[model samples]
Target: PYLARRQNWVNQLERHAMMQPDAPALRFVGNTMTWADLRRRVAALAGALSGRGVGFGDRVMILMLNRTEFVESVLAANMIGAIAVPLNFRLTPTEIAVLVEDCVAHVMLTEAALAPVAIGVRNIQPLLSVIVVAGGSSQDSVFGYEDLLNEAGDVHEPVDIPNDSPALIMYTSGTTGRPKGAVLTHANLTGQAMTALYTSGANINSDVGFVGVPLFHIAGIGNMLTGLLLGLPTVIYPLGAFDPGQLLDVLEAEKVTGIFLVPAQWQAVCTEQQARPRDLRLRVLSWGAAPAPDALLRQMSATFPETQILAAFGQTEMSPVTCMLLGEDAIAKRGSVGRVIPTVAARVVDQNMNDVPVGEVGEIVYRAPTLMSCYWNNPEATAEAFAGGWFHSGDLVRMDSDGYVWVVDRKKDMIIS
Candidate 1:
């Protein structure tokens, strides 16, 4: 009954810890955390957060770059039935303050390099309590990350989180103006986990993935879940400069089986890999987020002859993925975003929400278990987003007779005077 009541990432982590206690779960710089270690730490972290007055539906804003602690903080937040809001590190103090105020967050998780911005944000939003990871305390009410855990002494009273409970609030840049928060629930993400696990064709037993994207992105959250779901290790690659050679070396060293990079990153990786090929266990080479030339696709295939080059396509709102172009159809369906994935129901509809004839252009709408619960604290926008009873994607496309969808343009949002 308890397991049935709680089925989120925290639940999955508990299961993995019991069975694969010593098995690798997360790999950061010079450290590999076993499942048990990750499980134990999050419990302690959750306890510390609870001691600090965080509770169900409360927001915990993780204001740091991509790292293992980011993952830990997210799991810990959800573990106590609170929501995790990962902020973009590229944003200015004012921008971060805007989101902190939007989410009504009180607890902020940050680190050294990002401390100045966090402190600046606290100046505007005074009630926010800061928790620094690795770096020391601040001028205000900030606590050291390790010291708090030690003081709390792993006193977590586990909360039963239903599958439908909101877990993350990912902010997306709007078509017209300011970013809107998409509240993705636990079930929404697991739907993505199952799809990615199968579509990416990862070996649940041995394959490790390289998380190259920032933790704020849905791609990062989705990838992180699959690893936890399968009890596999994910090398939490830190964010830094564009060093493709270094990336390739990481792939080779870590025996990474799959990684998803944008077209330009792939271009750089391909160029570096050709100069000196490493014996990589790399099997799935996923690319998307932008168009790649047919030449680049061909080059990828040639370079990693044994690899599967697939394309992932979706917006951040559909728990982030709805269509996948498989490796077998990469060249043939070059411009297509492939077929609608297994868990999603999609239709191309005209302006009035009536289905368009096949091969004709229209906006694509979706119905899926992976769809977000709502736009955070914005009901009018939520009603508009789910107009006609389906999530409006605002993407114009033509679904071919063969079921592959081809992109045409976006449903332009006009704000005429």
Candidate 2:
């Protein structure tokens, strides 16, 4: 209830670290880190980055697979008011170089396993200090990840950061054109985290959750934030092909109470569980990023009668979730994307940007404090998106008399037949 007292999202971690310093904060690949451990490591890393001249407003790129260190690097950057840029490892070297140069990032935190890709990106930009993580030896040119933490002191002077300070620059997938970075501020992230916590029914003290999605996306980071802010321990899965059998084993072993996956992964998990039933303790099973089929919903209902099924809807630009389909509504209001969440105000508009009548299909627009600060380095796109005093969501949708939203299609993918 008092999370608002903190200056930013990272401050929540500091609070927990002081209150329950020995409690587990992160678990990954059989290794665990307490809240105090996380706080010390983040501060040490922040001190190291500061020694290297990375201060407030400087951009630092994180290029690596999912693991505990990824979250640590992000926290360290935020501790000093540096903006973190998390890159998709799936992108090619040229594509990564484009974003690297666009953000003008000088320090990259990555694992040695991806050294080749990092080297390729550095070759093009030629102004980066690549810090190699666990797995390989660092040469004279590259720096080792542990060296920085070991050499630096544990405490650094705190920097004052305003609520609207830019904290992240998340790049979008370039399906339509070149990818543009979405500027997410500290205020946007804290608001988004609070909204997610309000919707989530997990008991913060005892609930254990799992994160399998790539950390580069908002959904992945947002899920972790929801747990971290409430002092819940989350099991981090490796980045690779989704294997239902392996996930089921982890769920059972960890007694995971909550999980968030895409629709396809949920289907696979349901199938695997049906084939070999195990004693599981899942209380919340959430899906997003794609439509959940009616068949899949029924399967989930039958498979886990005690669990709640939720469907979230939003875009990366809106801090990722403006509407949610919850519990009984998952089956009762199967077609609707539920109502606008408490934090947001939404409207459906036509070409004139005028509000459309109820039951009429139009572009969905939103006004909220959770909205992104701006499009990084793209004022034209930002102006176009926020025209008419609202953040235009390219989703074609209709609002019923009851104020529930139904997504019809993407504006670019509407079929006229």
Candidate 3:
């Protein structure tokens, strides 16, 4: 094994902690967690998880609203080479029960508001280790999240994690029958971090990131990795009601330099910022999970004149981003999702595996380091996903002579019609 190549987010966070101890690493509700504190908390949690028998390759499920605890739990699990599984809070209790059964994660980290779901799952599964919650008193099977962290001595040294090791088993509900866990490895994430930095043209440490998206999505995880790798102060915005003006308050007040939101969020944000302009330090305003209309793009340009408007396009299985529409091309290339990123190799091919000519729609297939290692535990799905030597994206697209990709449709949407 090439020990020098061993790299992961836990290692990066540790480096940042030792290098810039007092730097703000995570922010939530006026609470700023410095790298020193983040490191200590993560190490302690890692030790506690280890004490409870969570080891390498094991999964730790996380069910909570966006907060600092969610961030800490992910890092702590990965520190000891365990995989972190983030559950979508929006899913129904029936869906949640199915996931809890599917992932088989013994320990779950959840908030007080979501304690019922945690308890329900743990109740159904007798083998589950513990249900952890913050600001809640301990029960027989549930423990106060803070109290659990306080007992263990901090684990200063992280386990030597291979680049190919799975860091997250995020469920993607392209799940259909049973939930599909996309095994996003450390290399997959770090590759995406570099991709984001280059595509957004954002600086390390200088640009702060605002994670408006839910952490369960690949986009959120990718953004989080970018922040950690760059040692940038990232404010994890609370996932709640959509308040454009209130959201702008954080974007302006926190002096966020970068952000990623849905098209709808961006449209309102553009209008809100225009109403009463604040001296914002925004560098890049990125949007995805849907396309931005040319009208919305124009509005964004006029509102945040100094910021770069980036549009990323991809699915959860590819570490989420494969193409980007940079600010300069936002209007001119309004209809397209920009060019396929440099780190990713692509081919617009037919079902027969033959290349489709430019200007003709075909399925866009990709091969990249950012691609998920496999669809976890489902060999049938995994084998088919990587069929014919390329990871089929399920996207029907056409590339123009200028190399911009136009997403025409989803191949799955047109099945047997």
Give the winner by lDDT.
1
Backbone clashes, each candidate = 0, 0, 0
> Residues 1-417, candidate 2, lDDT per residue (tens digit)?
135454575787788898889988888987888999988888888888888888999988888788887888888998899999988888887888888877888888887777778888888878676555544555757777877788855656777777899989998885467567899988888788778777876586679867888887777787787767788788888988789998889888878888888888888988999999878989888887777788998998888888887777885744458898887787677778888998899989999999888899999999998898888888888898899999988889989887788989643444863
- After TM-score superposition, what is the CA distance of residue 389 in candidate 3 from its true location, in Å? 1.0
- Determine the C-alpha RMSD for candidate 2 after optimal superposition of all C-alphas: 3.0
Instruction: Give the alpha carbon lDDT tens digit for every residue of 144-227 in model 1.
Output: 787776775568886889888899998875535555789989988887887887787767678896788887777777788778
Candidate 2 clashing pairs, residues 3+ apart or interchain: none
Colliding residue pairs in candidate 1:
none
Q: In candidate 1, where is summed lDDT lowest over 10 consecutive residues?
A: 131-140
Q: Of models 1 and 2, which has the larger TM-score? A: 1
Model 2: weakest 10-residue lDDT segment is 1-10
After superposition, candidate 1 runs with Cα above 4 Å error: 138-140, 175-179, 317-319, 410-417
Predict model 1's lDDT versus the native: 0.84
- TM-scores, all candidates, are 0.94, 0.93, 0.94
Model 1 error, position 36 (Å)? 1.6
lDDT of 1 at 206: 80
